Amino acid sequence: SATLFNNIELLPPDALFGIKQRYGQDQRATKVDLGIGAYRDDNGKPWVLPSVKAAEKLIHNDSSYNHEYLGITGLPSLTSNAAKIIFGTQSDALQEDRVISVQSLSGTGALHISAKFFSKFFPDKLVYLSKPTWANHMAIFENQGLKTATYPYWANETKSLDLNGFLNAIQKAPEGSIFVLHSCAHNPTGLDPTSEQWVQIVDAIASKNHIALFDTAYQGFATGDLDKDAYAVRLGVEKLSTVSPVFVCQSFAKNAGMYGERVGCFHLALTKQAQNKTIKPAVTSQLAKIIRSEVSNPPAYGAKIVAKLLETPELTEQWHKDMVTMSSRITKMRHALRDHLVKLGTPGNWDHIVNQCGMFSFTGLTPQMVKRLEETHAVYLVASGRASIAGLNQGNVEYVAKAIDEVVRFYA
Amino acid sequence: SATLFNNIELLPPDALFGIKQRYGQDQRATKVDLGIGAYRDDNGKPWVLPSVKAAEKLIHNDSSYNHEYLGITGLPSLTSNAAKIIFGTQSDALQEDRVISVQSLSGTGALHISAKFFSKFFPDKLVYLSKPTWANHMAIFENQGLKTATYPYWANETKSLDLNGFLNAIQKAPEGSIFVLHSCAHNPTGLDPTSEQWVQIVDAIASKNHIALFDTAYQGFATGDLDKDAYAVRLGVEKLSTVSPVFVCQSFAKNAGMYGERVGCFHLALTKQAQNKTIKPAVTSQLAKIIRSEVSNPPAYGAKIVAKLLETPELTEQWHKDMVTMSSRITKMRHALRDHLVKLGTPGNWDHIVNQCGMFSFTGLTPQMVKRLEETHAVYLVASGRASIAGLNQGNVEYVAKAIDEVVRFYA
Ligand SMILES: *Cc1c(COP(=O)(O)O)cnc(C)c1O
């Protein structure tokens, strides 16, 4: 047992969290961080939403403030209200009591409960991801032994969404397969299907009896409206109601700015069955077990902040405004960056920067160009070309626009 | 695919968190809660440590206060200081840079990291738990496909440690087995091996090349002295430095009263060898993948409080006093109960309640006696006869003394 770990290999640093580390140790005064999609304000610093500042003040003025354990399934105030913003107030699933909501460790925790659940009951089901999906998606499912497949999404040629490649993959896929869909604001591309395209996408999923899992991490950042950004999820909840179980992995890391507090919810819209009376508490019990065996119970403070935010009508209102505040500054920078490149006369077309939505911009820069931006210009992007627009501000947009210009011309 | 969940079994509630529910759903005004081992003051209310209050104040008074993502392995401030309280600042494992430390979702999260790491690299190793042990222990390891075994610990007849059977199991177990040890304040019995007995237990484990896993959820509650309570762990890391890697699952849930903030650390004391230059980084990158693909990164807020406590001298001196205040009240309630049963002339001997340490007492009551306590007296205990002394106070010890006197005469 003295040489037990001698054969264990070194895994490389995380694709996204690694760029954060390199950025941190870089001593150059010119460094710019456009890696991890974290919201930064006009001065390039983290921004605690006003709505949460107010909510945190109420929480601490409460005489019953403590750090006592929450239930295994989390805070009811959080779960109940969270499901309302995703599914909708006039939701059939909610009204019919077909929704199982449990508090998880943000969006990743919700995705892990789904993967662990799948690996225990339906280990054979293939997990389909978007060709250019979130960097951690594959690992989450493969950490549980599930086999993952890929469906066309991004067409590099036209910088558009390959709708025919997507719909084909849903047809040429085993009946009952799990399709992981980005509800809105596609991390990495930032290109979502239109309302019309979502109908086709969901009708295809309904005809093959496939299981839809909506990874919801940016509700509020696509259009700045919560209801508009939940169109895909609600559309699937009505159509897959008699077809298959709907999985919703909700994260408050971005829209509520909770990030490191790990606040999120795992939802499950059961199918219309007569025996749902027993099924409901049956599955819920399975979930409670997974949570108890791995985490015991979820973090309280962050969950208490979001609950009060969702409960209190004036903080819910202020939160809506904080999201328009964030989504509007990101738009102003998409324009500022595109116009600077147009003024610099940078080769090629750059309108895709403003056309894409969300927090990012799939620039279309080659790995070579991305490497030079870091090593030569101290600008940090994801090796894929993805850049966090929130890292841009009036004080650095031109420096970044000139750096991009140089690297595009350098490899021309 | 509509009937996928029409065959999923229904699992029973948590043996511990279930008492909390049933107790909460009780209308009786004369009810006492001796279920979950969560500290309560003299008025029976949650008690946020005075030192924790001061640390939490400084964090919010910080201009740079935010909710950003921490690194995958956590707040370095937390992990470094936490390693120092258990290992000791003068530890050879620390001075030799042999300890890997990452942040985890409290003690359960750390125990889970252990199980997944073993499940992933050494699947056939058996995990030995004490008889009896913490109710959730088994599920953490079995959730990862690991086979569990047990070792004689508590002897109900003598109400003492079955050292020879404990030692016989160690000797008979296949070399390289994992033994989950309770550092101090054993859950549920409240019975710990004396310093001399620990020497024998550790020597036996060393002789058989066994792997020691110290579940440290009560450092500071057994004797009310941090160093005194880290004896077994320090002994283990010393004697096993040339034999096997030592795993340490540390929780701040009880000693720091963080409970629901989920603050803990997973520590790993590697064996002595020149290959550590590559082993340490390789094993560390492995642990990071497990965290990233399951929960991404750990809770920010609770880590900051405890971190502030440990690194601020006046705050840490206060933390030591707070732990004495807590452990002091528990010991006060143990004597009050024993003395009340003696005065009532309750059949049998009850010195075991005062002989035990930590916050529990394995009372010896039968499951039926326990069942009659809440079914007639509204006194909630764990089915195994375990009672958390913290739930007792000057306003109810007399009442629980009478309720117990009644059940002992009724059945026996
Ligand atoms: C941020 C994100 C998640 C989950 O984030 P958590 O911080 O773990 O909640 C999931 N998917 C995408 C695309 C994300 O951007």
Ligand SMILES: *Cc1c(COP(=O)(O)O)cnc(C)c1O
């Ligand atoms: C409390 C406790 C743990 C872990 O508790 P967390 O609240 O999840 O940190 C682990 N083992 C024992 C024996 C405990 O009492």
